């Protein structure tokens, strides 16, 4: 919830076979990690995205790289999102409410 | 009050673009036009028609409004007579009460 | 004021115990040493603060008053003279007297135990008479004075004795550095003067000065004392009408007590009713530091202000006077002005700021970022320049009235609509 993903995979005890026993649980949490990465990163480093997903190898990271279409950039981060595509402001633009206001002020 | 020759530049104030778009576009369709003058020559024909209807009605209004005019001097005077003469009827009647 | 028609007759004829005298020819900064020569007399001989001067700048002019005290310890004075290599041959009278005091004591000490033992009033009050007699002869006999006034402070002639005795105690206990016992008189002396006698000015104004005394030094939370004393004899920077009285550090320490421990809302109350009044008009002609601290501030100078403010802090660090909040003033003397300067501002440089107060621009930056963190200004840094920008021109105040002026009437017409 507080999105301490580094601490999440550290915190894990690996002797609790129930947490192995839930099918797709280990990937589901990873898919939620990468889900929130897309909402609030424009880029992420290759080593950084690995560590958040439980210190992945080069080959293990190929799945997560391909999943949302993400790909390498020069020296040497993984692209996540375009800068204008992430932010999405819906701020100051109104005072275009003429039509309704004149329809009620019509008589 | 100005103190100088009129040379204002163009500025936009309330009902400028409104009433400009009414009349400035109107003038273009008035001064050159091959579409207007035919319509107005047939509006002319509906105007002739109304005076033509009128001169028939005028001949009846020459009888009818003559009978209104002359009687309206008598009748409407006699009505406002009774309006003002009622103040006497208000007075001498109420005197009879007490 | 209304007591001042009465103070008008008297014309400054107050009743100090060392009478006029303190240390002679002096060399250092002078509005400092003002208040020491003041409170030398008004406190009945200070002690430690003989030597508190002599530390920074040597004198042998502390020695005359260092002959003349007996209630701190007789022999402590009898050494400081000998140390200055002075023949002083005929010291044969304090060995006579304060010896025979002990012969007298063996009565009262005996009577004292036996009475509080029995719990018997008469034997304790005749003791209290014998013992309240005794303790002003020499108050060293240190704890004995505290013991004497522990059970009963109501002596045969209550207030007149009690006043001069609790004052003799508040005096001597601060000199003994027994600040727990002095804090006991912080309760009781101020209550005694609030149970005022005749209320003649020579009494009242001296008593008002004795309130400035316990608040001076600092043991615990004398800023509570500040909030208590300011709501007594109300809202005057001396408490003493007629403009003769001059106490610089009553207002400096009040300025410290306001800002370092509370909001400054709350300091423009001070800026009116303590920084402009009849007593303080006199004062504004005089003291350099406390003038710069407020006059520059309220005029909304920044250039001469933050320079001459920063200059005050050289004279502050020269203070060996008892204060114990000396550096939080140095802190806030820079903070307080800055907020006010930047309040209506467009664009100030962190670099110009850092040249002035003699810090690095990084320090000044994180300082500014912490002034904005604390939300004492709404501003934002032009990082590229290292300039900081306030820019609220806040136009269109129309809407502020419009919601409530109808929401009032809508719900207030409901009243007359009811019945």
């Amino acid at each position: 919830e507080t999105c301490h993903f580094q601490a999440f995979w550290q915190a894990l005890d690996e002797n609790m076979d129930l947490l192995e026993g839930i099918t797709g649980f280990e990937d589901s949490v990873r898919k939620f990690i990468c889900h929130v990465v897309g909402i609030t990163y424009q880029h992420i480093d290759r080593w950084l995205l690995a560590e958040m997903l439980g210190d992945l190898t080069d080959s293990q990271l190929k799945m997560w790289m391909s999943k949302y279409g993400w790909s390498a950039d020069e020296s040497g981060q993984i692209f996540i999102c375009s800068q204008e595509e992430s932010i999405k402001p819906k701020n100051i633009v109104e005072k275009i409410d003429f039509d309704s206001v004149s329809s009620i002020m019509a008589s | 009050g100005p103190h100088l020759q009129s040379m204002p530049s163009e500025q936009i104030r309330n009902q400028l673009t409104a009433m400009s778009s009414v009349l400035a576009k109107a003038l273009e369709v008035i001064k050159p036009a091959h579409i207007l003058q035919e319509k107005e020559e047939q509006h002319q024909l509906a105007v002739t028609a109304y005076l033509k209807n009128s001169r028939k009605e005028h001949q009846r209004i020459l009888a009818r409004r003559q009978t209104i005019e002359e009687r309206k001097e008598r009748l409407e005077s006699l009505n406002i007579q009774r309006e003002k003469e009622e103040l006497e009827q208000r007075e001498a009647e109420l005197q009879k009460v007490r | 004021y209304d007591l001042t028609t009465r103070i008008a007759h008297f014309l400054d004829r107050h009743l100090v115990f060392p009478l006029l005298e303190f240390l002679s020819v002096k060399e250092i900064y002078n509005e400092k040493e003002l208040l020491q020569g003041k409170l030398d007399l008004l406190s009945d001989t200070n002690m430690v603060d003989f030597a508190m001067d002599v530390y920074k700048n040597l004198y042998s002019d502390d020695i005359p008053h260092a002959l003349r005290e007996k209630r701190t310890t007789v022999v402590a004075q009898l050494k400081q003279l000998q140390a200055e290599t002075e023949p002083i041959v005929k010291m044969f009278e304090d060995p006579e007297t304060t010896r025979q005091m002990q012969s007298t004591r063996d009565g009262r000490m005996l009577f004292d135990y036996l009475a509080d033992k029995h719990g018997f009033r008469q034997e304790y009050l005749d003791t209290l008479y014998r013992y309240a007699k005794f303790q002003y002869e020499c108050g060293n006999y240190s704890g004995a004075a505290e013991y004497l006034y522990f059970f009963r402070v109501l002596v045969p002639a209550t207030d007149r004795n009690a006043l001069s005795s609790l004052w003799g105690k508040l005096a001597s206990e601060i000199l003994m550095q027994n600040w727990d016992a002095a804090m006991e008189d912080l309760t009781r002396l101020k209550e005694t003067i609030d149970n005022n006698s005749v209320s003649s000015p020579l009494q009242s104004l001296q008593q008002r000065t004795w309130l400035i005394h316990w608040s001076l030094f600092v043991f615990f939370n004398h800023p509570k004392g500040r909030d208590n004393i300011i709501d007594l004899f109300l809202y005057q920077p001396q408490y003493l009408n007629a403009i003769q009285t001059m106490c610089p550090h009553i207002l400096r320490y009040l300025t410290t007590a306001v800002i370092t421990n509370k909001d400054v809302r709350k300091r423009r109350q001070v800026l009116k009713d303590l920084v402009k009044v009849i007593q303080q008009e006199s004062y504004t002609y005089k003291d350099p530091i406390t003038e710069f601290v407020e006059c520059l501030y309220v005029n909304f100078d920044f250039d001469g202000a933050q320079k001459k403010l920063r200059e005050c802090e050289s004279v502050l660090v020269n203070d060996f006077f008892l204060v114990a909040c000396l550096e939080d003033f140095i802190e806030n003397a820079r903070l307080f002005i800055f907020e006010t300067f930047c309040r209506i501002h467009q664009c100030i440089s962190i670099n110009m700021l850092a040249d002035k107060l003699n810090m690095t621009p990084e320090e000044a930056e994180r300082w500014i970022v912490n002034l904005i963190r604390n939300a004492r200004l709404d501003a934002k840094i032009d990082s590229k320049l290292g300039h900081v920008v306030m820019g609220n021109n806040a136009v269109s105040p129309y809407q502020q009235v419009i919601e409530k002026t109808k929401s009032l009437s809508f719900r207030s017409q409901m009243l007359a609509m009811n019945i």
């Binding site: 003429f98 004149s102 002020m105 | 936009i12 309330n14 009902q15 673009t17 409104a18 778009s21 | -």
Partner: protein
Amino acid sequence: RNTSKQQQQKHQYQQRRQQENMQRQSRGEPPLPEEDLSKLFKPPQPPARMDSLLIAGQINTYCQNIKEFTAQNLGKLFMAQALQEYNN
């Protein structure tokens, strides 16, 4: 507002003081008057409802709402025309 002020003060605020004076009398003296008690309320000019504002003034509230409703309208038309005309 100042018409209503003074009249509402004669209506209630004066009744407030004189009835609290009627307290002091104890509302009856049996042997003899009751001069004071009688000479409480002695007429100020409005006892309620000053009419010429209530009628004739209110005909001009109507006319002032009309002037406002008039001056508004041609404004409303421009606020359509201006935006729209430039929108092309």
